[PDB]
Design a protein around this ligand. Structure first.
Ligand SMILES: O=C(NO)C1CCCCC1
Ligand SMILES: [K+]
Ligand SMILES: [K+]
Ligand SMILES: [Zn+2]
Length: 356
């Protein structure tokens, strides 16, 4: 059984000044429509959405940050515009806080259904995204770090040391998710992202391969940074074969969370990459071999409505047990991609004997 959560109330979050801003309300409604259109929806068990509580938000976020975003619910447009412009790439409406609560709570229920065995796996069609949100601030269309919160929520209903793998294949680095767990060895963060030597958003060298985690978390933060332009299925398949899967198998996670941005997809207006829907299917299908299939796919970015609808639908098809579609002939890896993969291997072979 595959769970699915979608609540159109999360469309209420909108940009009052720029109705064509790429983080559109119809992102989640188009993904949902494509599931119904491919007759995938009726094959899933519907999981209800709910508001995350403030105590649940406190699992990852400061009390100050919670109260600021919470206060935006009663703000006038002038206060909303000014508050949004205080962050890096944030727009806010009076419904933003509620929708971020719904995004988190949707994933809490989905992780709860997985960990209790109600469903084998699940998909969360939610917005606003989360992986850029930090402990104490919002960033890059994200208010609260949904994936990070779900990992802590999972631990709170099982045991504190539950091994949670977070795979972040959104094209941008999840700076918030990395920082939140950087000193933690119970949550293994693996991110593939366009980096361009720090030039690509979020424009920090924190996303480079040499950031392996700190303290107890040393070795439990894996950055796979792409440099030198367009990447696609050949590069992502290789990164999974050489890095993501062997590290994940050695970590032996008890729950797998996918920060599933689809802005690395062919056709995305911001990513500039060419990962295909079949590619995302194969990536999903491989992660399903971990944690006894307990995988939760959480929507992050991705802004070509057609690309993200086909891509995420193909992921759900894999969760439902369908056989992987056929990849195109995988071209030779771009030379810069082999350099990136080798750099990560050298950085993490000390901590992961499966890489030696
Ligand atoms: O998809 C994203 N993050 O994952 C966006 C974050 C803000 C800057 C544009 C891209
Ligand atoms: K990423
Ligand atoms: K970590
Ligand atoms: Zn992104």
């Amino acid at each position: 059984i595959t769970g699915l959560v979608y609540d159109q109330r999360m469309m209420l979050h909108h940009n009052m000044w720029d109705s064509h801003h790429p983080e559109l309300p119809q992102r989640i409604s188009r993904i949902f429509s494509r599931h119904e259109e491919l007759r995938l929806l009726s094959r899933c068990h519907r999981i209800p959405a709910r508001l995350a509580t403030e105590e649940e938000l406190a699992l990852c976020h400061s009390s100050k940050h919670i109260s600021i975003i919470k206060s935006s619910e009663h703000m006038k447009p002038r206060d909303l515009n000014r508050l949004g412009d205080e962050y890096n790439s944030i727009f806010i409406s009076n419904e933003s806080y509620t929708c971020a609560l719904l995004a988190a709570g949707s994933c809490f229920n989905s992780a709860q259904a997985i960990l209790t065995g109600q469903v084998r796996n699940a998909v969360a069609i939610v917005r606003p995204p989360g992986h850029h949100a930090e402990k104490d601030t919002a960033c890059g269309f994200c208010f609260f770090n949904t994936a990070a919160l779900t990992a802590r929520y999972a631990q709170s209903i099982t045991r504190e040391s539950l091994r949670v793998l977070i795979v972040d294949w959104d094209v941008h680095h999840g700076n918030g998710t990395q920082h939140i767990f950087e000193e933690d060895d119970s949550v293994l963060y693996i991110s593939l992202h366009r980096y361009e030597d720090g030039a690509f958003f979020p424009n920090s060298e924190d996303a480079n391969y040499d950031k392996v985690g700190l303290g107890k978390g040393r070795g439990y933060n894996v950055n796979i940074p792409w440099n030198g332009g367009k990447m696609g299925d050949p590069e992502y398949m290789a990164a999974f074969h050489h890095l993501v899967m062997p590290i994940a198998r050695e970590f032996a996670p008890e729950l797998v969370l996918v920060s599933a941005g689809f802005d690395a997809a062919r056709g995305d207006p911001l990513g500039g990459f060419q990962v295909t829907p079949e590619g995302y299917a194969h990536l999903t299908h491989q992660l399903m071999s971990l944690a006894a299939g307990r995988v939760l796919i959480i929507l992050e970015g991705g802004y070509n409505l057609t690309s993200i609808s086909e891509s995420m639908s193909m992921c759900t098809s894999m969760l439902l047990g369908d056989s992987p579609p056929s990849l195109d002939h995988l071209t030779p890896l771009k030379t810069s991609a082999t350099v990136s993969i080798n750099n990560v291997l050298r950085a993490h072979a000390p901590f992961w004997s499966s890489l030696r």
